A paper describes a structure:
The discovery of the bNAb VRC34.01, isolated from a chronically HIV-1-infected donor, identified the fusion peptide (FP) of the HIV-1 Env gp41 subunit as another specific target for broad immune recognition. Structural analyses demonstrate that the improved paratope expands the FP binding groove to accommodate diverse FP sequences of different lengths while also recognizing the HIV-1 Env backbone.
B Superposition of VRC34.01 and VRC34.01_mm28 bound to BG505, showing no discernable differences in binding. Template antibody VRC34.01 recognized 60% of strains in the 20-virus panel and ~50% in the 208-virus panel. The binding of VRC34.01 to the other peptides was significantly weaker, especially to v3 (AIGLGAMF, KD = 2,500 nM) and Thai, (AVGIGAMI, KD = 580 nM) due to less favorable enthalpy changes in the bound state compared to the decreases in unfavorable entropy.
Numbering used by the authors:
A (entry chain J): 1 to 107
B (entry chain D), E (entry chain F): 512 to 546, 569 to 663
C (entry chain C): 31 to 57, 66 to 141, 150 to 184, 189 to 309, 312 to 321, 321A, 322 to 398, 410 to 503
D (entry chain I): 1 to 52, 52A, 53 to 82, 82A, 82B, 82C, 83 to 100, 100A, ...
F (entry chain A): 184, 189 to 223
G (entry chain A): 80 to 127
H (entry chain A): 466 to 503
I (entry chain E): 224 to 271
């Protein structure tokens, strides 16, 4: 199994600020990472696939960068609907694993 | 990433897929081309479908591409028909776009293929005579 | 340097707009299902990702084909039935005044006439109850159709109830369906699928109100070939149906008169009990909210501050000036004056009752010299339907006034079929293609 | 228009077997690989496995091998997940997800089912 | 003398040309072999044309000449059918005269070709087994 | 009905058989199409 | 000269009571009987 | 045992002549295992 | 194919040396007349 570590575990920020979440992989993942957003009592939604391509129907504020072992998800301008749990998931080799989880809350 | 094999998209599922990706499902489209007053219109429709299928098969046969879904030919590609290279055809376009672009350069290619096939047949007959 | 050569590909997924003959599929009726292939229990729909197609409901050949097929089926359902040529005789008619309401005075005529029997050399004096619309005075009367053409009696066992029908294309042809909600019938559809054929469409024959049709998924839909042209009919599709309850409460009696060898004419003997007008009921609050939704959707096209007025039909034949339909064999023509009567300014259990007149001599399609006689139906008849749409027409629309007037319309059943086939088109597959490749033979 | 609908919530005793259904609408069922995932209450997601709806090929996490099985029915467009020998660690919300599956390889879980809650307790 | 390339004589313009010259327009003839009471007779005619075309194609296929306009065969030419040498067949005669001469020696050749093709198929299957 | 009527009158009209047409059975062979 | 090919070693299931040939023959005979009567006099006046 | 004459349905008359006949459709295509490889 | 004889002076029977293949024939008007052919084609050279 490949371990994915997400930082910060908990984060508090206000609307209009910039939030960066770092997902680190023990082994190498060229571009096969996906960023997911999950809200309380609801299934997750696809924000990013290929670690650099924005999913259709997602606001343009979301962006992703990094390849290999380092990846960063950046939200330039927070919104009231963007405060929820964020996961990073790799699919380079079996078994697929998700990140520990980063919860973003309004200050 | 990891994969679990190929998938089936349906009769025309690859219509939106690129030309290179759409060439992976030729048989799927090929299979479905064949299957007291209303007993006449039905028979007319069946006959018309048969004629269209046989016209396509006859064209393929007289081009030397009988029983082939992808067929190389000896006819060179005149640059006037299309000046686009492979990089922006097979990976960045769909067969519908290619069809709308090339529909006005169709019959000449068909005639050239027919003449080339006839020449090939005569050349093979000459070769086997020795 | 390129070194490119022709390469032939067969089975390419490419299609072109085409017109072909579709065939009927379905799971005694006028709409003959005995000549239709069984419908597959698991119809297959292939959702074409990334495919954006062009659609136009107002030039769809499917509507013309459906109109032709429906007319052909209607004609073929009447061929093996009695032709009432002997019925064209002088009629001695009196008024039916036994237990009638004030709105039914003169509506029914008790007409006695001589008629042929199974023996060529004998005559029988019989009588029947005809409708005021079905007879014309020459105390002597004649059937309305006599000076135009003979009427063919509809066979009693054949049922007029619509049955769903699926229109499926032959081999090498594909039916493309537009899955895009909010689609107004014309333009580019980005969400497309291929279907062996459509959902079951019921051939409901109606005017001024689309009955038992499909409902819009999101909101009320306004569709027109050219909204700015007042001469073009406006098709309104509801998202919530309006229940309409139509009844003929007369306890009709049917009697058979032997007019020849193996030929029987079905006359109306005598109404058992009180005689009162057939009618329809529509919920007042539901109709008001539906008209509010229609006004909201029309304001998007005719301005945000315009006054939207619903008025009566301008005039014409009884078929077009009234909501004409069939309910359990009998042919109703309902005065839809309580429905399209209101004005809207930009800013309970009671129901609207629409009186209706019953007719037996029917010219179902807009034809002259081809008429059908509906046999009377035994007993009271009551039926419930969904109003799912409207066929409207804009009155004038000059720049002098800011008020927009819409009136009910119809008559042409092609609009009724267009309301169901708007999201469908037919294409022919072009499997052959030629491309350049480095490969050489 | 792509939606995945699963069976209702289930409560089971330890050592039993549970079936989770997942039907699809809005897309060709045989056109995308289907992942099965679980999430425990208040924890992260844990990927059970995935299945090819077309060929029926399945790949399961190595820790689950020999305990969870996967099947698909094309006539009615469903994937069945059989979880046997349940324990109190298996309680949580199970999700079936469609994969983007570009290039016949995993890319992203774009469409997710509303999920089903499985509860295991004596 | 000098020349400016080939010419097109039409659907049957090579009927009067020699057999060798007429063999250069096979595709021209091949193309045109496929394309309430009166809707039946036309449907019958189209169906009959389809059956004749498919009969010809089936014969060619079972002779091993599928998708070929000129096809060599392993059946030797029995001298009883014709004794004329090639000098007085391909350069001094028409296909119509050849058909007139050989129409009484047709079905036997067809059967021989069918059996030869079956034997070839069996031999190829045996060869590929090794 | 000394007054009578034809038996079929109260059921349907009768079609007279054309005199030149013969009712003698002729052998007939029922043959299958191609592929059968 | 009708041709009959005697199939050696072939044993086949037969059932005269489920043969569709009988139904086809019945339908065709009825159709021919109807067709032989269409161009003939209809004795409607005889009902006197 | 009592036997009485019957009839009325002409399908029995046709069945007396078609009893020894049946119709089948030829299935020319077949697939078999064999050592040869393309 | 519809073969047309282009040979003028041709009397309708025998060998025609000048021949063509037409997609199909010219427009023929179905004139119903007796003792005199009306609105028909005319001989190119002389009375035939
Ligand atoms: C929109 O859809 C709704 C719902 O589908 C339609 O409303 C239904 O309409 C049908 C048909 O009108 C109706 O079914 C009839 O119900 C009657 C009362 O239950 C029955 O009596 C009737 O049976 C007679 O007619 C059949 C043929 O239609 C015969 O097969 C049957 O044997 C009966 O015929 C006998 O009786 C009659 C009358 O005495 C006699 O003349 C005959 O000789 C024979 O002796 C039908 O089953 C449904 O009940 C309706 N349902 C509802 C909820 O109203 C509505 O009509 C549609 N709208 C439009 C515009 O089409
Ligand atoms: C419908 O169109 C979209 C794009 O318009 C198709 O998605 C595209 O699919 C291709 C390959 O299938 C992707 O290319 C990949 O790019 C990544 C990163 O560059 C690379 O690592 C891979 O090796 C591959 O080349 C492309 O990124 C992707 N586009 C998007 C926006 O996701 C889609 O497949 C089409 N649908 C069908 C049914 O064909
Ligand atoms: C119709 O028939 C005539 C003759 O029957 C064809 O014309 C002939 O054409 C051939 C070659 O096409 C000529 O051959 C030549 O022979 C001379 C002999 O000296 C030689 O020097 C040349 O090099 C050439 O080989 C032949 O002479 C000629 N005949 C005549 C009388 O001129 C004609 O082609 C036929 N039409 C069609 C459409 O095929
Ligand atoms: C229609 O007219 C007929 C004939 O006048 C009526 O039938 C008569 O009814 C009376 C009783 O009301 C009888 O005494 C007669 O013997 C009947 N005559 C015949 C010829 O039937 C019939 O009642 C009238 N119906 C209506 C509704 O007015
Ligand atoms: C049915 O026919 C009879 C006669 O065939 C009609 O009775 C005749 O009526 C005319 C007036 O129109 C008189 O001049 C005759 O003297 C009457 N003859 C007899 C024998 O009564 C009768 O009116 C016809 N019935 C209907 C309803 O038209
Ligand atoms: C009138 O409309 C209602 C609502 O659309 C119909 O009731 C629906 O019937 C379908 C059957 O195809 C069911 O799947 C829905 O669940 C029903 N919805 C409701 C709210 O009842 C009703 O059948 C329609 N009636 C007619 C005669 O068309
Ligand atoms: C919709 O209908 C209007 C009304 O006819 C069309 O506009 C008219 O076009 C005619 C063409 O000669 C002009 O004479 C009129 O002056 C125009 N009137 C107005 C109010 O524009 C319009 O072109 C139609 N739209 C489409 C798309 O066909
Ligand atoms: C249409 O509505 C009218 C009311 O405006 C109905 O008339 C009532 O019918 C019921 C039948 O159960 C009677 O009990 C009432 O006495 C009637 N009241 C009035 C004022 O007429 C009529 O029945 C409705 N018809 C339909 C088909 O819905
Ligand atoms: C049309 O008819 C339907 C059915 O008869 C009516 O619905 C009934 O309404 C009554 C009174 O609200 C209820 O007690 C019944 O339970 C309803 N039955 C059904 C099946 O819905 C409806 O109200 C009528 N509408 C009009 C305008 O007359
Ligand atoms: C729509 O409403 C108008 C206004 O009520 C109707 O006009 C009436 O027509 C009748 C004839 O049946 C006259 O007796 C009235 O005097 C008219 N009213 C007025 C105010 O002049 C019109 O007929 C209605 N249209 C339909 C199709 O019912
Ligand atoms: C449709 O209904 C309206 C409303 O009842 C009719 O208009 C009435 O017509 C009568 C004439 O018989 C007048 O006496 C009333 O004053 C009118 N009332 C209204 C409100 O306009 C209309 O005539 C009906 N349509 C038809 C064709 O009869
Ligand atoms: C009668 O014959 C004359 C002469 O052939 C016809 O006139 C010729 O018409 C054709 C049209 O097809 C022209 O091409 C010729 O130039 C005309 N020639 C002369 C001398 O006028 C005339 O049309 C014929 N009329 C009829 C009714 O058949
Ligand atoms: C029948 O009644 C109508 C309306 O009540 C009247 O116009 C007509 O003159 C009456 N006919 C009679 C009594 O013959
Ligand atoms: C038939 O009569 C009606 C009314 O008498 C009239 O309106 C119609 O024009 C007539 N039709 C013919 C064909 O005479
Ligand atoms: C509505 O119809 C008009 C007709 O011209 C068309 O241009 C427009 O695109 C349609 N609406 C949408 C959302 O496509
Ligand atoms: C109609 O009349 C018949 C005969 O009197 C009776 O049996 C039936 O119940 C009546 N129907 C109604 C609705 O009154
Ligand atoms: C139409 O509405 C008006 C309300 O201004 C009312 O007075 C009139 O009676 C209505 N007419 C009909 C036929 O409903
Ligand atoms: C015709 O009359 C005969 C005897 O009179 C009777 O048996 C038969 O039922 C009648 N048929 C009809 C249709 O009235
Ligand atoms: C004229 O017809 C006769 C009929 O036998 C034929 O022999 C003759 O050849 C024809 N004329 C010409 C010039 O061919």
């Amino acid at each position: 199994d490949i371990q994915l570590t997400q930082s910060p575990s908990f984060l508090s920020a206000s609307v209009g600020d910039k939030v960066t979440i770092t997902c680190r992989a023990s082994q190498g993942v060229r571009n096969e990472l996906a960023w997911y957003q999950q809200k309380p009592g609801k299934a997750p939604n696809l924000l990013i696939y290929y670690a650099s391509t924005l999913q259709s129907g997602v606001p343009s504020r979301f962006s992703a960068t990094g390849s290999g072992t380092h990846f960063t998800l950046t939200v330039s301008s927070l919104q009231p609907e963007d405060f929820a749990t964020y996961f990073c998931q790799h699919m380079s080799s079996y078994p697929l694993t998700f990140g520990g989880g980063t919860k973003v809350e309004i200050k | 990433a990891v994969g679990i094999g190929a998938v089936f998209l349906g009769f025309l599922g690859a219509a939106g897929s690129t030309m290179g990706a759409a060439s992976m499902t030729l048989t799927v489209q090929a299979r479905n081309l064949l299957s007291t007053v209303w007993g006449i219109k039905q028979l007319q429709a069946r006959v018309l479908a048969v004629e269209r299928y046989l016209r396509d098969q006859q064209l393929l046969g007289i081009w030397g591409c009988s029983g082939k879904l992808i067929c190389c030919t000896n006819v060179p590609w005149n640059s006037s028909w299309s000046n686009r290279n492979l990089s922006e055809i097979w990976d960045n376009m769909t067969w519908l776009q290619w069809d709308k672009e090339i529909s006005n350069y169709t019959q000449i290619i068909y005639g050239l293929l027919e003449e080339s096939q006839n020449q090939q047949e005569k050349n093979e007959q000459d070769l086997l005579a020795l | 340097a390129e070194n490119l050569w022709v390469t032939v590909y067969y089975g390419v997924p490419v299609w072109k707009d085409a017109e072909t003959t579709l065939f009927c599929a379905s799971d005694h009726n006028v709409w003959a299902t005995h000549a239709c292939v069984p419908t597959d229990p698991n119809p297959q729909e292939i959702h074409l990702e990334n495919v954006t197609e062009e659609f136009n409901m107002w030039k769809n050949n499917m509507v013309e084909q459906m109109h032709t097929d429906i007319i052909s089926l209607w004609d073929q359902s009447l061929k093996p039935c009695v032709k009432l040529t002997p019925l064209c005789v002088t009629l001695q008619c009196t008024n039916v005044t036994n237990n009638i309401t004030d709105d039914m005075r003169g509506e029914l005529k008790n007409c006695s006439f001589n008629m042929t029997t199974e023996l060529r050399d004998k005559k029988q004096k019989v009588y029947s109850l005809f409708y005021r619309l079905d007879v014309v005075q020459i105390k002597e009367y004649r059937l309305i159709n006599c000076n135009t053409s003979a009427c063919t009696q509809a066979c009693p066992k054949v049922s007029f109830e619509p049955i769903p029908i699926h229109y499926c294309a032959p081999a090498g042809f594909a039916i493309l369906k537009c899955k895009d909600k909010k689609f107004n019938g014309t333009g580019p559809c980005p969400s497309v699928s291929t279907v062996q054929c459509t959902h079951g469409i019921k051939p409901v024959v109606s005017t001024q109100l689309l009955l038992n049709g499909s409902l819009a998924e999101e909101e009320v839909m306004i569709r027109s070939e050219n909204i700015t042209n007042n001469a073009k009919n406006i098709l309104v599709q509801f998202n919530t149906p309006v229940q309409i309850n139509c009844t003929r409460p007369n306890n009709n009696t049917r009697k058979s008169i032997r007019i020849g060898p193996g030929q029987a004419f079905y006359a109306t003997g005598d109404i058992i009990g009180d005689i009162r007008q057939a009618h329809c009921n529509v919920s007042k609050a539901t109709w008001n909210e539906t008209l509010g939704k229609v006004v909201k959707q029309l304001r998007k096209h005719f301005g945000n501050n315009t006054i939207i007025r619903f008025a009566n039909s301008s005039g014409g034949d009884l078929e077009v000036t009234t909501h004409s339909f069939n309910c359990g064999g009998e042919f109703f023509y309902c005065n839809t004056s309580g429905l399209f009567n209101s004005t809207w300014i930009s800013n309970s259990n009671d129901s609207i009752t629409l009186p209706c007149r019953i007719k037996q001599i029917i010219n179902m399609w807009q034809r002259i010299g081809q008429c059908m006689y509906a046999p009377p139906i035994q007993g009271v008849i009551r039926c419930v339907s969904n109003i799912t749409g409207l066929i409207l027409t804009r009155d004038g629309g000059s720049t002098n006034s800011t008020t927009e007037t819409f009136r009910p319309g119809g008559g042409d059943m092609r609009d009724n079929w267009r309301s169901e086939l708007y999201k469908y088109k037919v294409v022919k597959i072009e499997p052959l293609g030629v491309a350049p490749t480095r490969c050489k033979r | 228009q792509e939606v995945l609908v699963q069976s209702g919530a289930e409560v089971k005793k330890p050592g039993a077997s549970v079936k989770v259904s997942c039907r699809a609408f809005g897309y060709t069922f045989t056109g995308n690989a289907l992942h099965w995932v679980r999430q425990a209450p208040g924890q992260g997601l844990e990927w059970l496995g995935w299945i090819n709806p077309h060929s029926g090929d399945t790949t399961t996490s190595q820790k689950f091998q020999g305990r969870v099985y996967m099947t698909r029915d094309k006539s009615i467009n469903t994937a069945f997940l059989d979880v046997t020998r349940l324990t109190s660690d298996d309680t949580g919300i199970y999700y079936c997800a469609r994969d983007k599956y570009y290039g016949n390889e995993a890319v992203g879980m774009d469409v997710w089912g509303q999920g089903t809650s499985v509860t295991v307790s004596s």
